[PDB]
Each structure stands twice: as C-alpha cells, then as structure tokens.
Subunit: 53 residues, 2 copies
C-alpha cells in the first residue's frame, strides 16, 4: 500500500479479513477446549466402573 | 484522490486521458486552420474570373 496506488478498499479487505481469519481460528480453539473438557467429564461420568470401596 | 483510496491507476486514466482529449482537440484546430487556409487559396485560384486589365 506504500506503493502509491493499491486502493485502500483492497487493503481493508486484508486488514479486517485477517482479523476475521485469526478470530475464526480462536473460536475453534475455545471449541477444542469445550470438547476436551466435556470429554474428560464424559469419562468422569465413567468413574462408576467398580463403585470403589 | 486526496480521499485516501481511489487507486492511482484510475487517477492516471484521468490525467493522461485528459491530455489526450485536450490534444485531440488541438489536432482538430490545426485541421480547422488547414481547411480555412486551403479554402481561401481555393477561392484565390478563382481570381481568374475577369482576367482584370
């Protein structure tokens, strides 16, 4: 964009459509979490396999 | 173009394609001339209409 032309309208694509990419990846982190979590709790509702004394 | 975006590639259209308009009008001036000229000479080869004494 320092090369005079490349209209801001196509830099702005890149800016906001970088942050959207980045953030749409964060969402899939928090989802990775929630799935790891709810899976450990889904084996911790499987504590009950001897009913330990 | 002072309004940040409007890529130089579309300002340059306007610049050079102003000068081309302007200049393509000059050409038609010099043509207007050459036609006015060659028409007066085309009536001055019509001096010969009495062969004046």
């Amino acid at each position: 964009y320092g090369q005079k032309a490349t209209s801001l309208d196509t830099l702005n694509t890149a800016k906001a459509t970088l942050n959207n990419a980045k953030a749409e990846m964060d969402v899939v982190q928090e989802n990775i979490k929630q799935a790891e979590i709810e899976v450990n709790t889904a084996e911790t509702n499987l504590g009950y396999t001897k009913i330990t004394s």
